[PDB]
Design brief:
Chains A, D, F: It is found in: Host apical cell membrane; Virion membrane. The complex is a heterohexamer, with three copies of chain A and three copies of chain B. By secondary structure, chain A is mostly helical. Chain A contains four helices and five strands; from the N terminus they run E-E-H-E-H-E-E-H-H. Classes of the chains: A mainly alpha, B mainly beta. The structure holds 2-acetamido-2-deoxy-alpha-D-glucopyranose (3 copies), 2-acetamido-2-deoxy-beta-D-glucopyranose (NAG) (6 copies) and alpha-D-mannopyranose (MAN) (15 copies).
């Protein structure tokens, strides 16, 4: 992934996070907790649903047939016709494989981005109240209770209130 | 607090621009492979030619009495179809099939041809009907008495309608010069068809030939497309199988070849010999000769589109 | 201090790989739609065939006396163009048009054909000129006296130039066997044209036929391309319309069909029936049959290329 | 945008910044001010002008015509010709739409990058003399007068001089 | 501590989506230009027709006695190849070449044709062999005594094998009506070939004509493909050049045209007139008519693929 | 480059780093030293080797020929055949140039990423023991001897041990 986030400085993903695409997993004084982040998730989904839509379109182009399965057409014209059809088949097959191969590349990268987008959100948010370890976790330098951990999630965490106290 | 992303135990393999067979959290096909073994005709005006040959709908052989004037959205040719009676062939046939296939159907109207000094019966057991007859939209102009003499005859028609007209005519090829100077007069026979942008001439080729469907002679049909206000002229002296009626296309329609049953319960726009390719995907690997509004035919059997991040199991 | 980017009130919608109709700060067309209703011929050596039929420049009908030898970069056929005099047709015509269209022009040179015992007049009111005559680069070899007898005649030419030669010849189709055994001798008439890599034979088909432009007979022209140093041989005994001169291509050129006026003020390389597509864009939605150096024809009317960041209004 | 900058952690753009593509908007002791940044702007423009150029090329390929608008060619060969032409039309139309759709995607992302490129420039520049709020603003911990704000613009700001004093 | 990346003094220029001629640390071609001036036939069963014309392997001219039944993977036609003896031509030839080119080779089997009241010699100095003879897989059915009379003769064959059969037959075109009513009887001669999905009829065209390879007459060969269990019927009365043997395709094979030597040391699958394009690259700029499994032909001479970061020299 | 790393906030590359694609160049108390980083390098290489592979595939599609170099086919059918072949040539040429032009764009960007990937690795690693100047160097606030500089390379540097002492 171009952003070094997914399949990067975040080792693996969470198989228990069946709530969304991304999410927060904290470990405050009391107990832990793992909640998905609606914001980022929908952003990716929507976009990906985008491509899929872009790809499922109507070729309102109608082709009448020119061959004949019963009673074959003359041989000279026949080979020319098929020589043509195959050339076309060679082309579309090539296109078909490049589109999908290309699209996918982008798709995957598209997530890194979103994942990375979130991370950078949390960082800048916490200002100078937490440190960036490297595994994707933010060790908060102050008792961040459940109401607090979540405070960060719904983007309401006001570093200042706990600035000095950090 | 930490932040991550999801993942499943068994992801789905796909191909990237840089890798091959990478597991993503989830993908989806792109090349349709499912086929419906029926001709989904719901909502479409269908006409299964059956034992009638698409071209036979223009001449009039027994197999086609029920299709001399049909209206349709979808026409269908069957391998059992035949456009013939008396042994013979249709010169430049596939072209005619391509036209009628989208004609929307045909509409007959006489040529206004009346004759004198000759007979107009000319039937044959090869064209069995009501106990031996001839085509239908045709007339086998014959020399009155045996070994008689067909006149300098000339007939002409004028398409006076907005859209062009399909005009047919056949040339008879007796199984011998003896049968020829019998049915029609004697000597050289010349049939010349001419119009604004057309002008050929045909000559009979009477002589030994196999005996298909009881006859050794042959009647080959010819055709041109008469433009609006244009006039077609026939100049012959026998061996000419005259056209009793012209034809006009009703409008849009599609023709297919299938060996599968019609079904008015499903809907399709991509037909082919063995069914209908019902799918909204861009590519298909079913039949390279499918017609209508279809997905492009490719070689690959499957080209999977990732619809999820890369999958990273614990 | 803060740092940001620009934005406008009314952006421009475009299509992405992931979205549809996203506003960017600014885009630009990609599919040309503007057409110039004239044939931009500035700098090009032009020749508007007018009432002359491109093929007629090879035979020599009255409409083409002014085009029997022309030089050009751009040739132009008009719907009013005709390559004929005596009613008739040019066998395998479109092929000949495709060749002459890029020939750069033609250059005539006699065949060196002289004759004996026959006439070489043969004119017709159908080919009106200076008060009744015949083609021009042709010679209607005729049997001296009426009902006479055309000789075993044989004529042959050899292209002794670097580039191949266009050789023509016509077959006359009298309006009756009576007119035939009059103009030429009597009995079977056979015209056989042969060369290194060519060899056909033609036979007249005299008989009843409409009367176009005052004649009921027909003269159909035939043609082959004579290779360098090769020799063409004509073996006939009448009904043969001989070639007085051969033709050579001058070099590059393009042929188009238009119904629009020529204009030497603008410049174009992409012509089509109704104008010139003057544009540097990659795609066009104007005419799918445009020719020359054009932009590829597509279905879309507009495919907008973003040329700016995404637009985010306040 | 893959970089989460434009249409991201920078809410909207400035409709008054008709000077360049990107730029700085400060609010020092005295008065504010809004100046465009030539560097970044030209970088993007140039590149985008690049594509546009790449797309406006000469198809020195000349095609003679094979049909006939007056006097139609035979029917069999005629349908084959058109069956072919349309197949070609179907292809080019597809290409034409993918190129533009694909190009654009990239184009847009291309800006995020440049915008983000700038931001990261300003950050690393200021070293530890300012903080990163999140709206794209840099609250300088020291009177950064007009000469100072600009000092940052033309990349000459020497954090050290004001290091302690921050 | 600092961290950076590599770079070289002289990078390699490439084209991006946004720039043109950017130096990257290293690239690699994509359009093959190297050609091997030989026909790399290692491992393939090859047959260089040489002076024998691919079509001549079906009729039997002297140049082809050694190729009347050949097996192969790769067939090769040489410009010096000729499929003829007696001057003449093969009607609808290129189609036949396209078939035989992939036939894998041919396998002969008699037609089982025996005759009566006529001769079966008919040879010619034009078809020199062992001191004057005729084709080989042919039989020039001739009228016993001079000016005699060829009988109503009829012969028929039935392909009783799984795969279809190639059936040939020729029509002789004497150099005069006199030579015709000599070799065969007198009067109209008609040769009609018919099968399930075939049915033509031919007529000789005897008359003046150049004298190629000592003869002024001409024998033109015709052909059809006989389906399994189907039966072909020949109905003639002279001027017919009968088929002594039918042909069957052995299976896969490819045919090419080259003027270059065969080499069993190298291996290729992309042949063309002047060599073999041996490469694993996707595009080639060598020959647009190359055949087999090749790289797509493009216009560009070089399209370089970056295989390294951008190069930034100190 | 979309990441602003290569040909960006890292001026030029090192012509002496013939060991790998990326690498570390330090200047500790004693002497300097320049060692390539295997990790990042292989990551890029592998991927790029990927494309090249994706591009070198077998068109198991065999085309028989339909023209004739000796003895030319009829003229009408002949022009149609070539009109077709050229159209195909126009297409493939277009594809051929887009693929390469597109691929390359991506390729280059692919490195920025990897380079940037590394940099972000080193940063987050050093935690708050070093500062980010801007030329791509990390001025370590503590004697980082050869064993130390390298300590960072092989990702083993434990900021804490030198935390206070920084
Ligand atoms: C693609 C298609 O229409 N199928 C036909 C198939 O029925 C037949 O076996 C073969 C040879 O006639 O030609 C095609 O493969
Ligand atoms: C694309 C083009 O050349 N236009 C013609 C048009 O003039 C005509 O109405 C139609 C039927 O003849 O065929 C094409 O649409
Ligand atoms: C691409 C190819 O097959 N080469 C031929 C060449 O030999 C010849 O000079 C020309 C005209 O006949 O046609 C093609 O260019
Ligand atoms: C005359 C002939 O060769 N017929 C084949 C046909 O059997 C085949 O289905 C088609 C492609 O599928 O290619 C055609 O060339
Ligand atoms: C095995 C599975 O999970 N199936 C779902 C499928 O139903 C859904 O259409 C697609 C996109 O929403 O995501 C897949 O993962
Ligand atoms: C409405 C408008 O602003 N028009 C300009 C146009 O003149 C210019 O060619 C293009 C790229 O420079 O940018 C557009 O925004
Ligand atoms: C013989 C025939 O069908 N002519 C049409 C022509 O009218 C039309 O313009 C072209 C595509 O535009 O397609 C051709 O098939
Ligand atoms: C001039 C040069 O350095 N040649 C090498 C080449 O041998 C190698 O195949 C390619 C990819 O490994 O990288 C190139 O730089
Ligand atoms: C009949 C004819 O024009 N022959 C040319 C041939 O010489 C040329 O090689 C080919 C493309 O290379 O295009 C064909 O049209
Ligand atoms: O496979 C499609 C189809 O091909 C035909 O040629 C025959 O072989 C049929 O029996 C078969 O069903
Ligand atoms: O017609 C298609 C093809 O379908 C196959 O299943 C068989 O029934 C064949 O006999 C037939 O030819
Ligand atoms: O019955 C299935 C199929 O079998 C094949 O062998 C042929 O006989 C076809 O005509 C038939 O439709
Ligand atoms: O020729 C093109 C076409 O242009 C239209 O504007 C009309 O003038 C038609 O009569 C004409 O056929
Ligand atoms: O006058 C415009 C146009 O009108 C059409 O109806 C036809 O008659 C064309 O020949 C003519 O050019
Ligand atoms: O529309 C293009 C052109 O198409 C032709 O078929 C006629 O309908 C013309 O009158 C018309 O101008
Ligand atoms: O056949 C290919 C071509 O190759 C060239 O090198 C010459 O030898 C020509 O005479 C020949 O026609
Ligand atoms: O000898 C090379 C080449 O020269 C050309 O001029 C022709 O004569 C070819 O037949 C020959 O093969
Ligand atoms: O260039 C390829 C080939 O083209 C042919 O037309 C002749 O000109 C040959 O002599 C030449 O070798
Ligand atoms: O398309 C409508 C109209 O177009 C042209 O004017 C001609 O083809 C007319 O016959 C037709 O009615
Ligand atoms: O039997 C599977 C399949 O085989 C071939 O493709 C044809 O005979 C088809 O008609 C049939 O459905
Ligand atoms: O292309 C130049 C040259 O090419 C080949 O040698 C032949 O076609 C020659 O007739 C021609 O002069
Ligand atoms: O009138 C608009 C337009 O309609 C059709 O496309 C044709 O008749 C054109 O010639 C004409 O210019
Ligand atoms: O493909 C195998 C098989 O397919 C169909 O059934 C027919 O074409 C058979 O003649 C052939 O043996
Ligand atoms: O001589 C270079 C090259 O020129 C032309 O392409 C042809 O004559 C080839 O056969 C020859 O190899």
């Amino acid at each position: 992934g171009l952003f070094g986030a997914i399949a990067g400085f975040i080792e693996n993903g969470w198989e228990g996070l069946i709530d969304g695409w991304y999410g927060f997993r904290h470990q405050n004084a009391q107990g832990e907790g793992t909640a998905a982040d609606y914001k980022s998730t929908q952003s990716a989904i929507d976009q990906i649903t985008g491509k899929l839509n872009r790809l499922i379109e109507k070729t309102n182009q109608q082709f009448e047939l020119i061959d004949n399965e019963f009673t074959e057409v003359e041989k000279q014209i026949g080979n020319v016709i098929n020589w043509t059809r195959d050339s076309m088949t060679e082309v579309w097959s090539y296109n078909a494989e490049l589109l999908v191969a290309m699209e996918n590349q982008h798709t995957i990268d598209l997530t890194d981005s979103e994942m990375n987008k979130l991370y950078e959100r949390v960082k800048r948010q916490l200002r100078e109240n937490a440190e960036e370890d490297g595994t994707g976790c933010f060790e908060i330098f102050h008792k961040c209770d459940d109401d607090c951990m979540a405070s960060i999630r719904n983007n309401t965490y006001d570093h200042s209130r706990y600035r000095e106290e950090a | 607090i930490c932040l991550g992303h999801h993942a499943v135990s068994n992801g789905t393999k796909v191909n990237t621009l840089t890798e091959r067979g990478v597991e993503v959290v989830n993908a989806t096909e792109t090349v349709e492979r499912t086929n419906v073994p029926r001709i989904c005709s719901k909502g479409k005006r269908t006409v299964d030619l059956g034992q009638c040959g698409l071209l036979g709908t223009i001449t009039g052989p027994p197999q086609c009495d029920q299709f001399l004037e049909f209206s349709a959205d979808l026409i269908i040719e069957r391998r059992e179809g035949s456009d013939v009676c008396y042994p013979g062939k249709f010169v430049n046939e596939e072209a005619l099939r391509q036209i009628l296939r989208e004609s929307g159907g045909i509409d007959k109207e006489t040529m206004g041809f009346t004759y004198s000094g000759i007979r107009t019966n000319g039937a044959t057991s090869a064209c069995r009907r009501s106990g031996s007859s001839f085509y239908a939209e045709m007339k086998w102009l014959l020399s009155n008495t045996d070994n008689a003499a067909f006149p300098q005859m000339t007939k002409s028609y004028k398409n006076t309608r907005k859209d062009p007209a399909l005009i047919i005519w056949g040339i008879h090829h007796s199984g011998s010069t003896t049968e020829q100077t019998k049915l029609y007069g004697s000597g050289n026979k010349l049939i010349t068809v001419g119009s604004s942008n057309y002008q050929q001439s045909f000559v009979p080729s009477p002589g030994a030939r196999p005996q298909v469907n009881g006859q050794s002679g042959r009647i080959d049909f010819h055709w041109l497309m008469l433009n609006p206000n244009d006039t077609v002229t026939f100049s012959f002296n026998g061996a000419f199988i005259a056209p009793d009626r012209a034809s006009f296309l009703r409008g849009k329609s599609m023709g297919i070849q299938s060996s599968v049953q019609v079904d008015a319960n499903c809907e399709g726009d991509c037909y082919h010999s063995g069914g209908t390719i019902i799918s909204n995907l861009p590519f298909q690997n079913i039949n390279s000769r499918a017609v209508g509004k279809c997905p492009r035919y490719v070689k690959q059997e499957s080209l999977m589109l990732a619809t999820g991040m890369k999958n990273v199991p614990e």
